[PDB]
From a paper:
Complex I couples the transfer of two electrons from NADH to ubiquinone (Q) with the translocation of four protons across the membrane. The L-shaped complex is structured into a peripheral arm that protrudes into the aqueous milieu and catalyzes electron transfer with one FMN and 8–10 iron–sulfur ([Fe–S]) clusters, and a membrane arm embedded in the lipid bilayer that mediates proton translocation. We have determined structures of the electron-input module of complex I from the hyperthermophilic bacterium Aquifex aeolicus, encompassing subunits NuoE and NuoF that contain the FMN cofactor, the [4Fe–4S] cluster N3, and the [2Fe–2S] cluster N1a, respectively, both in the air-oxidized and dithionite-reduced states at resolutions up to 1.8 Å. Here, we show that the redox state of N1a regulates NADH oxidation in complex I by inducing a conformational change close to the NADH-binding site.
To determine the mode of nucleotide binding, crystals of NuoEF were soaked with NAD+, with NADH and with NADH plus dithionite, leading to refined models at 2.0, 1.8, and 1.9 Å resolution, respectively. The structures of NADH and NADH plus dithionite-reduced NuoEF were virtually identical. Noteworthy, in the NAD+-bound state, the peptide bond between E95F and S96F faces the FMN as in the oxidized protein without nucleotide, while in the NADH-bound state, the peptide bond is pointing toward the loop coordinating N1a as it is in the structure of the reduced protein without nucleotide. Besides the atoms of ADP-ribose, all atoms of the nicotinamide ring were also clearly resolved in the structures containing NADH, while in most cases only N1 and C4 of the nicotinamide moiety are unambiguously detectable in the structures containing NAD+, indicating a dangling of the oxidized nicotinamide moiety along this molecule axis in the binding pocket. Remarkably, the reduced nicotinamide group penetrates significantly deeper into the binding pocket than its oxidized form placing it in an optimal position for hydride transfer. The amide carbon atom protrudes 1.65 Å deeper into the binding pocket changing its distance to the Cα carbon atom of Glu95F from 5.37 Å to 4.03 Å. The two positions of the nicotinamide in the binding pocket are here called tight (NADH in reduced NuoEF) and loose (NAD+ in oxidized NuoEF). Water molecules that are here resolved for the first time play an important role in substrate binding by forming hydrogen bonds between NADH and NuoF. For example, the nicotinamide N7 is bridged by a water molecule with the side chains of E95F and D103F. In NuoEF, the carbonyl group faces cluster N1a in the reduced state enabling binding of the nicotinamide in the tight position.
Numbering used by the authors:
A (entry chain B): 2 to 419
B (entry chain A): 6 to 160
């Protein structure tokens, strides 16, 4: 049928796995997916034990593509040691600044994600799975609903899937404008029909999640890897990129590059290679000043030779690459990041509630040259004191990128202090 | 206040979709805003009854979620991304073009109630910055002439 207009985001792959179909900017329906051997990994998986599937996902080295890089197999193992029923949740809330990797799988190859969800749900013994897609992805919502009906029609969903005795229904829930609803426990609160208020962890969802039952939350991109692990086997999957951080990775590249878009590359690729080898270098061939890893980290032009992996010295995060060049004002850029956290704090924790607001309020005064000496010292203090008592990652990192700009670009900040 | 049968039927479909009625709350509020061009305050008591939730619960959910608007009726919401990448690549050029065409700024509605400009955080299309939506449709802004053509399709 007819879906809402979507920008045609450029997509390029050196691996031809996650983007084998999604490199073409259109919906690939189930017939096209089946032509490429789609759903044969599910058939293979249903002839394996759930425990065997968990062992393969563990040995694959697959790590959470949502940005934290938690080992996926180990997350499943934690869930299955707890009594059922269990739930499987696909996190499609993707709302990190610069991050548009998940939507191109959802909108172009929805069956890759659906096949992943069914195999993952079987592995952990979940008969009820959810996709939580952000409100601002309406096309993705309609495309997934249509794709789930296609999967039902072909007998990949419903009761007794392909005579396996395994039952599954996938429910598509929509967000309504809260970045915090991507936080796995806020997501679960929203699925329960409440405000997106993160829960104190532990417990982790794998112990107590949806309706207090063992719940696995995995990112769209994580789940899209599962069909490849089963199809190829964990050994062949581990041949992709470095053996310690294996498999394809999606890199959403934006800002001052010639070819902004999503790049499917192995994680031994360097940040320099992402910008210059793949994304075509900088607009006007201007020097790189900084890379924002979404709203999480700020890397200087001295840090471009790092691997795009989940190692301690690696890029990590979502793989989001926002490129700023020599003429971009780092303080103006810092203000946009402060404004983001101001807008998205849920306000449960006092230092996060007041700190996100004051960080943005004071940095605006600084940017506009209206800051008193006390506003300057106030800004420094609040930036260092958003994290205390925080119960989710937002409070923990709301000052992180901005602190990195103060340390890495002091000359630029000093210009504003004068 | 009563929901028209065509809207009520859609709401009942959402409530019947999930295993628990209360899980449909966001899909119902999206449906209500789609129908009316905003969330009418009077709509919340009947919705609460249909979801078997207290009114104060439904009110708190409407307040929490930024896509829901209880203030201004608008046929078309122009969601303009004001986040880092769209800001770098020309959010201010898009806002200027919108002011030239429609005569309104962020937060304002055209005098005919047709267009509201809604400033939003990153829309997850950053490679295509600066980004805007017109209801469910999403576009890269290229120029005033291009924007004028796009807006002409919404009547
Ligand atoms: N994709 C997007 O648009 C966005 C991504 N993010 C990412 O979110 C990340 C932070 O996420 P968190 O969930 O706070 O990270 P985390 O490191 O606390 O947890 C990561 C995952 O591992 C699980 N886990 C961690 N420790 C565990 C344990 N002891 N037992 C069982 N399971 C355990 C958690 O339940 C979760 O599913 C950031 O690194 C950022 O990159 C943030 C916002 C938006
Ligand atoms: C404020 C906040 C927002 C988040 N938003 C998302 C999101 O949009 N998508 C996502 O998959 N993970 C998001 N996460 C991370 C999730 O809590 C969780 O770690 C992830 O969904 C687990 O899946 P993974 O192990 O496959 O990465 C967010 C975390 C925080 C603290
Ligand atoms: S740290 Fe911030 S966003 Fe997270 S629960 Fe506390 S107040 Fe809410
Ligand atoms: S910053 Fe505007 S779409 Fe991401
Ligand atoms: Na097709
Ligand atoms: Na897309």
């Amino acid at each position: 049928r007819s879906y809402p207009a979507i920008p045609r985001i450029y997509a390029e792959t050196t691996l031809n796995m996650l983007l084998k179909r999604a490199k073409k900017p259109r919906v690939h329906s189930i017939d096209e997916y089946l032509k490429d051997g789609g759903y044969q990994a599910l058939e293979k998986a249903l002839n394996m034990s759930p425990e065997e599937i968990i062992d393969w996902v563990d040995k694959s080295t697959l790590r959470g593509r949502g940005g934290a890089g938690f080992p996926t197999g180990k997350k499943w193992k934690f869930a299955v040691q707890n009594p059922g029923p269990r739930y499987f949740i696909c996190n499609a809330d993707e709302s990190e600044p610069g991050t548009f990797k998940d939507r191109i799988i959802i909108e172009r190859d929805p069956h890759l994600l659906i096949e992943g969800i069914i195999i993952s749900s079987y592995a952990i013994g979940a008969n009820e799975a959810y996709i939580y897609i952000r409100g601002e992805y309406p096309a993705g919502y309609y495309i997934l609903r249509d794709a789930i009906e296609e999967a039902k029609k072909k007998g990949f969903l419903g009761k007794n899937i392909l005579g396996s005795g395994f039952d599954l229904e996938i429910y598509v829930a929509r967000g309504a404008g809260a970045y915090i609803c991507g936080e796995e426990t806020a997501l679960i609160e929203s699925l329960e029909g409440k405000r997106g208020h993160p829960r104190l962890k532990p417990p982790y969802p794998v112990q107590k999640g949806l309706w207090g039952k063992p719940t696995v939350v995995n990112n769209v991109e994580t789940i899209a890897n599962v069909p490849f692990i089963i199809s190829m086997g964990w050994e062949e999957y581990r041949y992709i990129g470095p053996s310690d951080y294996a498999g394809p990775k999606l890199f959403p590249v934006s800002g001052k590059v010639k070819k902004p878009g999503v790049y499917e590359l192995p994680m031994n690729t360097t940040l320099r290679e992402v910008i210059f080898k793949y994304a075509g270098g900088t607009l006007g061939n201007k020097k790189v000043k900084a890379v924002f890893s979404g709203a999480l980290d700020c890397f200087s032009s001295e840090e471009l030779d790092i691997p795009m992996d989940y190692s301690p010295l690696g890029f990590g995060g979502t793989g989001t690459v926002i490129v700023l060049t020599e003429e971009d004002d780092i303080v103006e850029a810092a203000l946009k990041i402060a404004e983001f956290y101001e807008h998205e704090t849920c306000g449960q924790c006092t230092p996060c509630r007041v700190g996100c607001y004051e960080q943005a309020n004071l940095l605006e005064k600084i940017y506009k040259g209206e800051a008193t000496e006390q506003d300057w010292e106030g800004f420094d203090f609040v930036n260092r004191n958003i994290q205390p008592t925080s119960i989710c990652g937002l409070g923990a990192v709301a000052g992180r990128l901005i602190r990195q700009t103060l340390e890495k670009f002091p000359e630029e900040w000093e210009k504003y202090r004068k | 206040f009563e929901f028209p049968e065509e809207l009520k039927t859609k709401l009942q479909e959402h409530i019947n979709y999930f295993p628990k009625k209360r899980q449909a709350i966001l899909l119902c509020l999206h449906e209500i805003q789609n129908y009316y061009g905003y969330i009418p305050p009077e709509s919340l008591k009947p919705l609460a009854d249909m979801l078997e939730l207290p009114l104060n619960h439904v009110e708190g959910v409407v307040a929490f979620y930024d896509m829901f608007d209880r203030e201004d009726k608008a046929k078309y919401r122009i969601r303009v991304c004001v986040s880092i990448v769209c800001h770098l690549m020309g959010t201010n050029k898009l806002l200027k073009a919108l002011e030239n065409i429609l005569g309104i700024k962020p937060g304002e509605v055209t005098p005919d109630g047709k267009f509201k400009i809604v400033p939003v955080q990153c829309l997850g299309a950053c490679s295509e910055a600066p980004v805007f939506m017109v209801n469910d449709d999403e576009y890269k802004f290229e120029s005033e002439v291009q924007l004028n053509e796009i807006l002409s399709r919404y009547t």
